[PDB]
Design a protein around this ligand. Structure first.
Ligand SMILES: CC(=O)N[C@@H]1[C@@H](O)[C@H](O[C@@H]2O[C@H](CO)[C@@H](O[C@@H]3O[C@H](CO)[C@@H](O[C@@H]4O[C@H](CO)[C@@H](O[C@@H]5O[C@H](CO)[C@@H](O)[C@H](O)[C@H]5NC(C)=O)[C@H](O)[C@H]4NC(C)=O)[C@H](O)[C@H]3NC(C)=O)[C@H](O)[C@H]2NC(C)=O)[C@@H](CO)O[C@H]1O
Length: 273
């Protein structure tokens, strides 16, 4: 399979171009558009990378294009651990979808946050706030694919199944890639010497929802999360030999680029993925 990586939440983690040039990642999720819905003006946060104001982050289009010519799919990630993002109604889901189309996809806007580049799809990283209308957002975004270029849909639900926020959206069967986050959740993550909870959780996710491919989401280092880190050797010798048997296995997802370089995680597991 391949490795999905989250980029954008630490200005010291290198440029998007450099991130994709590593040749270790097959998918890149730009984190995050952490503010939108309920009449709020959508706002993107890319840590210390760039200030989105006055097209200060339009330079990112160079990284997006650089990744795409290298066959890497790049998605805009909605939500994240911090933000006032939400959906007040189905009408809100429509407005956000139309906004996303014109500002990140094949639509048109004089103020596209990340430039003129056209993202491959949208990533759902909904962790809090509204538990409703995310299935509507997915449906509206997916319909835009009928205009010629497919709008990919990906999701980063936490490992507890079903996910309280993305459960219904995932039930639509419209998602291409689902990287379940097996961390910051004791009941379904790795614990010292115990892989039972993570494997058991993996089985729930791969024998339920209809998605293109399912990935094993993990923290790139102990610092990347409150808990759930898995040493490279354990992942390679105990976990991968099992989950790779599943025909839905798509690979591994890591949070994040910054911690990945610091701990050299993907550098150690890439060939086994
Ligand atoms: C898929 C998923 O759900 N993933 C989650 C994941 O979200 C969790 O990780 C945590 O995510 C949150 C975001 O949701 C991370 O929060 C980051 O934290 C950054 C570090 O503190 C912070 O970056 C700072 O951003 C400032 C702007 O807001 C930057 O300041 C600017 O600096 C410029 C010079 O560099 C200067 O010119 C500007 O004037 C100045 N502007 C301002 C306003 O100060 C600052 O430089 C930058 N710092 C760095 C180091 O880049 C982000 O703002 C903040 N994001 C948000 C949206 O608030 C949090 O760090 C993540 N934690 C970890 C451990 O990774 C993850 C947790 O395990 O769970 C996953 O499931």
């Amino acid at each position: 399979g391949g490795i999905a990586i989250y980029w954008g939440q630490n200005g010291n983690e290198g440029t998007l171009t450099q991130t994709c040039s590593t040749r270790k990642y097959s998918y890149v999720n730009i984190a995050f558009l952490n503010k939108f819905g309920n009449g709020q003006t959508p706002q993107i946060n890319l840590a210390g990378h760039c200030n989105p104001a006055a097209g200060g982050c339009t330079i990112v289009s160079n990284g997006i294009r650089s990744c795409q010519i290298q066959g890497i799919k790049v998605m805009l990630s909605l939500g994240g651990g911090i933000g006032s993002y939400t959906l007040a109604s189905q009408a809100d889901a429509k407005n956000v979808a139309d906004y996303l189309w014109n500002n990140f996809l094949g639509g048109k806007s004089s103020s596209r946050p990340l430039g003129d580049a056209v993202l491959d799809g949208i990533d759902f990283a909904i962790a809090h706030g509204s538990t409703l209308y995310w299935d509507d957002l997915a449906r509206y975004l997916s319909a835009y694919s009928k205009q010629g270029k497919k709008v990919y849909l990906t999701a980063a639900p936490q490992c507890p199944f079903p996910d309280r926020y993305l459960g219904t959206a995932l039930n639509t069967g419209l998602f291409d890639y689902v990287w379940v986050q097996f961390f910051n959740n004791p009941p379904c993550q790795y614990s010292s010497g115990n892989i039972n909870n993570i494997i058991n959780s993996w089985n729930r996710w791969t024998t339920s929802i209809n998605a293109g491919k399912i990935f094993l989401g993990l923290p790139a280092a102990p610092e990347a999360a409150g808990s759930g880190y898995v040493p490279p050797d354990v992942l390679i010798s105990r976990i991968l030999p099992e989950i790779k048997k599943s025909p839905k296995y798509g690979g591994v997802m890591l949070w994040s680029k910054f911690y990945d370089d610091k701990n050299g995680y993907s550098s150690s597991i890439l060939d086994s993925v």
